Each structure stands twice: as structure tokens, then as C-alpha cells.
Ligand binder design. Structure first.
Ligand SMILES: [Cl-]
Ligand SMILES: [Cl-]
Ligand SMILES: [Cl-]
Lengths: 219, 225, 217, 217
């Protein structure tokens, strides 16, 4: 039936959770080109601001429908609608900090609706995250592979620090399409290039966030 | 004294495991200083659970720990302010749990508020296939770091085939008392034994625990401790 | 200066994996600036291997990486001093590898000395049951830390049933060149593709690799 | 006999940690059934160590463990065949150790052969800066898996600033006895306490350990 993902679509996000005991909430509105793999989002901290932790760790928590797929690789996420999908992720930082995320992605007309829950634990008191000594993400590469009827992903991310060092993390994600399994055109092993740029940061409250993404094979 | 010989438990828990939302409510009682407690947990939403309940049991109570050898009770002494804690539990087969908990004191009742998110539990693993049979007793190591109490522990989940499914826990305990008033313990161990006494209708569970905070006693050292 | 368009490889490796001792010797060649190489490996002791050879392949060569976009070659520029590296590889099923490697240059030959210890590979896992079918291409992130070059990567071992067995690699690369003379690169990626050309009688293997150092393109 | 009340220890250890080659030899004695032992360790090569000796300490003895509660001693009952074990130790700051060990019996002497590879210890971390002050006592969990004995433990390294540096150990113990003659124990705990009694000139170390195998008491 009708194709539900358009050249131009918008984003509505609500995210709440707890990082090292600190409760917070934020809302996001954005837009992008799903098939060109580009998107931009404006995030407003609505509760718990100003954040006592670096916003940068929220960034990869704030969008798998906006990925350009090349080489005929099936789009597990775009093809999931109208049902949509959820995903679960644990991100383990090398200094002990850890993030676990549950996300819900649904489609409402021209708007992707994102619902995000986040719990963070054991971020070191004098680490770059809790001290806010971070300076954005390096581009990262995710490996995507099928397992037991759903799509799994793992990636390494490198958080830039204001002392010059990188703070790395390991991500494990399971993506769950709500589509009938037999109706799933599951992709094969492939890569996902993600580049996140925080265009603006204001008053520890307002953040403009840009991402370009591509699903591809090696070279 | 704010903590007495016999006290009661009121718990609310909400979370999502591998995409499945659930809520549960607990009521129980125990002897804080004898390090024993029992709680009745009802799954109020998302029941019957599509996963093994056993992984919720250690999410469902640090005030009921018997402290020996003069080890300060970071949890009992935190009141009336109380405390929070945060924890990530990594299972050897890829599954993971992250928990936030709030512990406060209302008269004779300890109030527990728990939020849980679980990810990447293997579809055919013991947890999602409900092939578990309770926990082995666990030893947590407790040590101070940056003004608060940290804890790490290995947990061994018994499987129905006779095997064990192990996991690694990292927890930060955060007392709400002013740092000036905190009486921080030194490095020590926490023995925890969990027993699920009842399961009824995949919706009602009875859970008992005993716990002791101690130093290493089996292999002694020339200067304490 | 010391690295030319065509060079050879002489490798010696010994180690123990899940209690099984082994030794092997390798001889190969490649084009350092085109980022390609091939090598013939013979299990000289402990053969036939009771484990999948596939896990040894990423242990058997950083001088054969094509560097684009002006990225300084930490490994090629390390000579004549050369370099060492240390790596731990953790498999998702509990198996783990730790490797020490020594790389030196004698005339036209790169000299590789490799030590490996493997622990806790599951008895019925793909590695010990030899149910593996080579590696997916992998991406390593390279970044400077405390005067030397660090590397992390995820690797995915293909299994005969179709599934993947993933692992996490953490590596520190140590140039023997004086710190003041080291031309440290910035954060970048490393694409590695490993193909096992031949695998005979659990003792004789041919191994090909193409590698590229690049930014996010 | 084969394990008597008073036996001796002969150890040889070799390895590399962050690229630094080292060798050390050990001589000691203890009471296997009282779970106590002492040992003198000499750094024979690579001295003085550029890293803290403390991380070598738990690499340097499963025979000297007092078994209470009727726990079968997997290690004592492994002789004359003896046993090996394999271990990976992951520190919270990125450093890692992987060890292969061989334990055999020669008359009144336990013979230990140890291979160690260490990777990615932070340049300014406690280990490489030698800011450690001995180990806290540890608890290992022991459980059977696929015909052999597995172990996991948390170890906490005391640091000079008061903090602790924790690590996670995964070990597989492999008895050389025939599977059919193996008396495998059930899930139990292992209490280990290590004390370094002397440590002259970064080349000589005296090391004491008491150990007990038990249930939860
Ligand atoms: Cl920030
Ligand atoms: Cl159940
Ligand atoms: Cl093979």
C-alpha cells in the first residue's frame, strides 16, 4: 500500500531519564531528508536544567529513519512502517560510565514520533562527562547484522575532550521492527556511518543537533 | 532511632526489558539489623512477564543488611535524608540491565522507587526462555570513591540445565546526607542470598533475602583487616 | 626512505589457546603503499590446530596500510627503529586473546615476532568447534593517547550456520622512534579486509589482506 | 602420596607488559591443606620493572587452598597428571592481563610455568606509575562448565591516594585427569588474601598468600 516515508519529514521527540541520580527531561523538534540521510533537530531542556552532565551523551540518544541506504541494502527502519520500531541500547564508556536506552519510533502523518527513556550510571565524578569537558563526537561506524529475527548493531564512539584526549565507548543495540517477521526484508551484514555535529549550545538549555548517516558495505 | 528492629517495605517498580513494558508493586517487612527481609511482589502491568522474574529480584534493598565488625552502615545512617543508587548489570551472554533506585523513609516504612531498562537479552537465552532457577549467593565488594560508596559484584544465575549464567554488577550508592555528616566505611564485603519462595500465576512472587556486611574472615591478616 | 614499493614478510608466532600450545612460521610479500599483502603460514608445532585458524589471522601487519588524505603513517615512519604493539580481543561468548607483537626491518624484509595467549573459548563455541567461515571487513579507530597511537575495533567472525561472532579489540601501537621525531596522526579510521585463501590439513594457510587509513568519507 | 602437608614451590615466569619484556623465578614453600604459602620472587630479566609488581602477584598457585565443607579439591586431586589454567584480567581503566599457567608435580615440589601478556595499561595510571599498595582480599566464584572448572573474581588494587583500582578475572582451570576420574566440585567460593612482605630494589619480592575454598557462611 501507500508509501509512508517522504522526501521531507519532521521529528517530534520526548526524552526523560536519570544520569548519576539527576532527573531530566527534554523535547525536540526537527526535520530532515530520510533518503538523503540528513537531519537537524532543536532540543530544549524542559526539566532538570541546566544539566549537571555534558549534553554530548544525550546526542546519540536523540534516529534511524534518516539513513541513506546505498548498494541495495534494505532499509529495516523505513520499511517498518506504519508499525514502526523500537530499539534498546547499552553504551559502556571506558572510564566506568554506562548508558542504557529504550526508544520508541512511531509515525504520525508527516512526523516521526520519538519516545526515549535513559538511565545513566557510574559516570566518574571528575570525568569529562560530569565535569562537562567534552567537545563533540568523532564520526562513528556501526556494524549492522541480523540475529534471531531482528537487527543488531554494535559501534565504537569517540567523545572528544577539552584536554585533547578521546573518551571511547562501546555500544550494543538491538533494533526491533514491529513488522511481521515473514514480511521483513532483513538486510545482510553492513556498515553505518554516523556523523553528529552539535551546531549550537545555549545556556545549557538549547541545543541544535545535526546528523548525516549512510548505510553501506566496505568501500 | 529512625531505623527500628522491625520495619516495612513499600516498593513501586517500572521498566522495559527487551522492549516489553512492565510495572510491579511490592509490600513486605524485615529486620534491618538482623539483615533479613521478605517481600510480596505483584506484577501490575505487562504480566505475564515474557522474561524470567529472577532478573528483577536483585532490583527489588540495602537497609536490611547486618553490619558486623564495626563497619559503618552507609544506608541506615543516611536517614532521614535517605539515598539513591544506580547500577549496570552486564550478563556474559550480552544481556544488560541498568537500574535507578530511590530509597526514602516514611515513619515505619522504607519507600522504594525503581526504574529498570534491560537490553539485548538473547532471544533463546535462559532469561527470555525462562530457564533460570534462582540465584547463587553473591559477594559484593564495597569501597569509597569520590565522596560516595561504590559496589561491584559477580552474580551467578542458576539455569535449568545445571549451568550458570554469570553477570557483572557495577553500582554507585549515593547518600543524601551532607558530606560533612557522612560516616564512610572502608573496603568490605556484602554477602547477599536471594530466595524466591513462591511463584504464583506468573504474577505474584514472594522474595526473601538475607544480607551481611563484613570483612574477609576465612583468610585472616596480621593487621586488621 | 626505508620502505619501498615491494617488500617481504617473515613472521614467527608462538602461543597457547585454551591450553593448547602451538608455533607457526610465515613468509609473504606485499605492496606497503598500495595497502595489500599476502602470506603463507605453516603450523610448525601443535598441528593440527584444535581451534579455528581464523582467530590467528588478525594476529599475523601495520606496514601494509594505504594512507590517504594526508594521514601520517605512524608505522612506516617508525623505521629503522620499528614498533611494537599490544592487543586484547574480547569475544562476546567469553573467549579472549592477548597479543604482543614486535615489528622490525632488515633490508627488504619486515620481521614479525608474535606472542599469543587465548583463554576461556567456550567448548562448543564456533572457534573450538571450527565452525567459522572467515572475517567480515572491519573498521579500526586510531587515535593518539599519551604519546603513542591507540586502536579500537569491532570484528565479526562469520559462522557456518550464518550467524556472526563479534569481538572487541583494544590495541596500543608503540613506535620506537624518539617522541620528538614522531609525526603523530589525528583521529582516523582503518579499513581492514582479511581473506583466507587456502586452509589445508589444519597446518597450511594462505592469507590475504587489504588495508586503508582514511577519514570518514 | 601425592600431596603432603609440607611441599615446596618452583616457579618460572616470562612475559611482556606494555611491551616491556621481563623474566622472574620463584622459590617457596607452604602447607597445601592449611591453605598457606610463602614465596621469594627474583626479577631475573627486565629489572627494574617499569610497572607495579602487584599485578604479577596473583599470577605467581591453586594447590595451597584449604578446602572446608567437603569441597572436592579439583587441584590437589589432579595429580600426578596435574593441571593448567588460563586467565584474562580486565582492569577498569583499560589495562588487561592474560596468563597461561602450567602446574606439575615433581616429588615434593610443585612446578609452575607462567606466561603473561599485558596490554593497554594507561601511561599515567597506578600500575605504570607504581602508585599501588597491595591487594585487598578477593572472592572467586568457582563453578563447573563443559567438563572443567571455571572461575571469576573481582580484585581491588589499593592505590597510594586512597582509591581502589578494580579488575575482573575470568579463569578456566583444566585438570589433566581423565574426565571419567574427575571429581568435579559444585558452585563454591574461594577466599584469597595476598600480602607482599618485602620488596627490595624492585628486584626481590617476598609474597604470602592464604586461601580457603568454602560455601557461603
Ligand atoms: Cl555541556
Ligand atoms: Cl518466572
Ligand atoms: Cl580451521
Amino acid at each position: 500500500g501507500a508509501p509512508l516515508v517522504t522526501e521531507d519529514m519532521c521529528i517530534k521527540m520526548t526524552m526523560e531519564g536519570t544520569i548519576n541520580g539527576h532527573h531530566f527531561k527534554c523535547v525536540g523538534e526537527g526535520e530532515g531528508k530520510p533518503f538523503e540521510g540528513t537531519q537537524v533537530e532543536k532540543i530544549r531542556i524542559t526539566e532538570g536544567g541546566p544539566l549537571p552532565f555534558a549534553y554530548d551523551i544525550l546526542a546519540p540518544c536523540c534516529s534511524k529513519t534518516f539513513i541513506k541506504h546505498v548498494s541495495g541494502i534494505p532499509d529495516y527502519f523505513k520499511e517498518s512502517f506504519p508499525e514502526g520500531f523500537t530499539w534498546e541500547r547499552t553504551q559502556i564508556f571506558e572510564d566506568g560510565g554506562s548508558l542504557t536506552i529504550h526508544q520508541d519510533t512511531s509515525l504520525q502523518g508527516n512526523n516521526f514520533i520519538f519516545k526515549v527513556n535513559v538511565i545513566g550510571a557510574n559516570f566518574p565524578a571528575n570525568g569529562p562527562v560530569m565535569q562537562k569537558k567534552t567537545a563533540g563526537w568523532e564520526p562513528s561506524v556501526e556494524i549492522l547484522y541480523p540475529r534471531d529475527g531482528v537487527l543488531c548493531g554494535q559501534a565504537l564512539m569517540a567523545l572528544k575532550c577539552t584536554d585533547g584526549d578521546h573518551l571511547t565507548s562501546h555500544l550494543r543495540t538491538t533494533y526491533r521492527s514491529r513488522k511481521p517477521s515473514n514480511a521483513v526484508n532483513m538486510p545482510e551484514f553492513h556498515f553505518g556511518d554516523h556523523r553528529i555535529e552539535i551546531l549550537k549550545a545555549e545556556q545549557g538549555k538549547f541545543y541544535e543537533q545535526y546528523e548525516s548517516a549512510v548505510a553501506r558495505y566496505c568501500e
